[PDB]
């Protein structure tokens, strides 16, 4: 196929990249000269600006880092593909997240928010809110998380309705944020409401972690009511999602699946091929494995001994 991008621009950008390991003051001027000589839109200059932010964040240079990020925000909506742009931006957001200047983190976030609003790119503005939302749940903040959830929900009404038919993808993130919200609060009334609202309209392509979290709440709700088949199914998918992603809660979710599997009065073994293999011999799961072995063998004396021992 081939397509002549530019001969001079790529040379000068990588020349500055070769000078990155040298003194930045000469390199950053060289990167700026690339941007001035960039002229036409800067797929390479976008990389140069991305590298400049990475370099400046090393030597604690925020003032122009966000000002050039605003240039990147305008650079998002000109030529660069959405896939590369938000992957670059997500890496920028993750790279800023490395330090602990949380004030600068959210100043970066709020500048990101309104910029993506302008170019009708609420797709990434939703993702940044989800990125900011997940961070909020980790440190238990709800004052602005609720505002985010309302704004994300506000972007999701089709005026008369409260949901779209393609933003069911978005409602996955919205409810997953709310699932973790009421996990700490232990609000069973909202937990079922979230799950019921989720189930019907969430039908879409989810992120594996989101699906596992949604199903994990459903298994808890079903177990707290009495349904064993539904709780077992929800724990099954949540553990399946955890395996693909790699969340540490997979072992804890497996314990949920084992208990639900034993509660439905079925001799079926909930390890099989789904629960890999080594998880049977895991020290935190070996006690559960012994419970399954005693449950299948109907050894009440051995079962009760394991209950008291562990």
């Amino acid at each position: 196929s081939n397509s002549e991008p530019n001969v001079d621009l790529e040379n000068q950008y990588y020349n500055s990249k070769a000078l990155k390991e040298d003194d930045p003051k000469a390199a950053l001027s060289s990167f700026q000269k690339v941007l001035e000589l960039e002229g036409e839109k800067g797929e390479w200059g976008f990389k140069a600006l991305k590298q400049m932010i990475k370099i400046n964040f090393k030597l604690t240079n925020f003032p122009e880092m966000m000002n050039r990020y605003k240039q990147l925000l305008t650079y998002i909506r000109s030529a660069v593909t959405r896939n590369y742009s938000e992957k670059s931006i997500n890496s920028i957001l993750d790279y800023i997240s490395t330090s602990k200047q949380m004030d600068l983190l959210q100043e970066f976030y709020e500048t990101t928010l309104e910029a993506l609003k302008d170019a009708k790119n609420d797709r990434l503005w939703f993702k940044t809110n989800t990125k900011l939302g997940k961070l909020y749940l980790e440190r238990e903040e709800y004052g602005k998380l609720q505002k985010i959830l309302r704004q994300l929900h506000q972007s999701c009404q089709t005026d008369d309705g409260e949901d779209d038919l393609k933003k069911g993808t978005q409602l996955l993130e919205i409810y997953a944020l709310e699932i973790q919200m009421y996990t700490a609060q232990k609000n069973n009334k909202k937990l079922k409401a979230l799950y019921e609202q989720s189930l019907h309209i969430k039908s879409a392509i989810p992120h594996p972690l989101i699906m596992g979290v949604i199903r994990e709440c459903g298994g808890k709700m079903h177990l707290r009511e009495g349904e064993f088949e539904k709780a077992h199914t929800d724990f099954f998918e949540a553990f399946k999602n955890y395996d693909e992603s790699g969340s540490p809660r997979r072992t804890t979710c497996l314990k949920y699946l084992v208990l639900a599997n034993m509660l439905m009065k079925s001799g079926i073994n909930p390890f099989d091929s789904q629960e890999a293999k080594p998880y049977k011999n895991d020290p935190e799961i070996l006690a559960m494995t012994n419970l399954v072995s005693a449950y299948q063998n109907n050894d009440i004396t051995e079962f009760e001994k394991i209950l008291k021992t562990n």
Partner: protein, 437 residues
């Protein structure tokens, strides 16, 4: 001009009868007169073909269709033949466009040309027919008829989406991109033998992802959302897991990056971004070959395999060469080359010792079949004036005893210069592709 004249005749007749006669005076006269005038004139004028119904629709006369709809609606059995003639014209237009005879038609242009026809007819329906249900039913039924005619069509359809997704320059705004693909699947619904279409659709979505990244992301999830809304589970869910495994790849690397932050890696592992996918969604390319690995990647793969077998026990990895890329730093300046995990073995042997031939790379490499030849020719055969692997017996065909050299090619002064001629004839046509079909 007759339709305007008869409309005026009705208007003056109804005006006279309500003002010069008694109060009601309208039911018997109007119905019989309207029925006779409309029935005979419509039949005799469409045979004449002198700017009748088919001609006044071909040139795009919005007013003529609008006045015809508002007049023929009063007489029963008028819309029935109106849609029948409209469907017949659509059939004639469809056959002249879905014609299969003649090779050399662009699949992207074929759908796009037909796509404009659907939008043009929809615009006429909205502007003139006032969104009549009968007209919508007939065009929907007609579109179901002429779209599933040819056999070689699901293959062409999947290529149309591939062109749209590969590059978005044509209509940079996502609204134009999404509209083209929105009503494109309207054509998809009117297609029987979905199994053969799915298999073609499975294969090319891999082809979209396995060459270059940075397609769209956000709309890629969006176009998947419409996919599950319209098709079903079994064949489509496999696709939705492929892009899901792409998310699995980076998330698995997020854990791998955490290990990179904790433990520093030596020269075997300077700069690695490995990827982890599941075989349950991503099909095998051709055979998952078993070629050799350069020593620096050998250590990197060994470290990753050891890490994956220690902290991620319960699954073992299989190495392959028909996937990925690399950045080969060459060295008057230092320009980094690019090899898509095909020439890495060939260049590594050259670094160990130059002046090799086809026999050298086929005896001490455990190299697969002609896919080597197609990969080998990516550096020598069919190359522009940016050659990174030259030979003295320059020929299109690849012989056995030919020596390879290297050229500077300062015309390729690009510190990261990429070789995009890797594909070339990878998916060639005729040799052994039709016989296995």
């Amino acid at each position: 001009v007759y339709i305007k004249k008869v409309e005026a005749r009705i208007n003056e007749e109804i005006e006279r009868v309500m003002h010069c006669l008694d109060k009601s005076t309208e039911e018997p006269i109007v119905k019989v007169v309207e029925r006779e005038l409309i029935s005979k004139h419509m039949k005799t004028i469409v045979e004449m073909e002198n700017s009748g119904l088919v001609h006044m629709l071909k040139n795009g006369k919005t007013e003529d269709l609008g006045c015809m709809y508002k007049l023929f609606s009063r007489v029963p059995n008028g819309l029935k033949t109106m849609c029948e003639c409209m469907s017949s014209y659509l059939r004639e237009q469809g056959k002249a466009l879905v014609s299969e005879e003649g090779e050399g038609k662009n699949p992207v242009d074929y759908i796009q040309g037909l796509l404009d026809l659907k939008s043009r007819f929809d615009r006429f329906l909205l502007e003139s027919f006032n969104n009549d249900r009968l007209f919508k039913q007939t065009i929907a039924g007609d579109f179901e008829y002429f779209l599933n005619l040819n056999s070689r069509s699901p293959e062409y359809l999947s290529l149309f989406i591939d062109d749209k997704l590969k590059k978005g320059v044509k209509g940079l705004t996502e609204q134009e991109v999404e509209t083209i693909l929105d009503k494109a699947m309207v054509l998809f619904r009117f297609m029987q033998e979905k199994d053969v279409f799915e298999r073609y659709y499975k294969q090319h979505l891999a082809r979209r992802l396995l060459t270059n990244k940075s397609v769209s992301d956000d709309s890629e999830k969006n176009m998947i959302s419409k996919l599950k809304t319209e098709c079903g589970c079994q064949f489509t869910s496999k696709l939705e897991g492929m892009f899901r495994d792409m998310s699995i790849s980076n998330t698995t690397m997020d854990e791998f990056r955490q290990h990179l932050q904790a433990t520093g890696v030596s020269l075997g592992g300077v700069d690695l971004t490995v990827r982890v996918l599941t075989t349950g969604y991503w099909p095998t390319q051709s055979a998952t070959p078993k070629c050799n690995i350069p020593p620096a990647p050998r250590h990197a793969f060994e470290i990753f395999r050891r890490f994956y077998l220690a902290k991620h026990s319960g699954r073992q990895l299989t190495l392959q060469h028909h996937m990925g890329s690399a950045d080969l730093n060459a060295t008057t300046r230092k320009h980094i080359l690019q090899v898509s995990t095909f020439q890495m073995t060939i260049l590594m042997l050259f670094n160990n010792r130059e002046k090799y031939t086809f026999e050298e790379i086929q005896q001490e490499t455990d190299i697969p079949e002609r896919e080597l030849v197609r990969a080998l020719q990516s550096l020598a055969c069919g190359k522009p004036t940016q050659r990174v692997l030259t030979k003295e017996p320059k020929s299109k065909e690849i012989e056995n005893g030919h020596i390879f050299t290297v050229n500077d090619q300062f015309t390729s002064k690009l510190h990261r210069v990429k070789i995009q001629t890797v594909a070339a004839k990878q998916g060639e046509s005729d040799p052994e592709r039709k016989e296995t079909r």
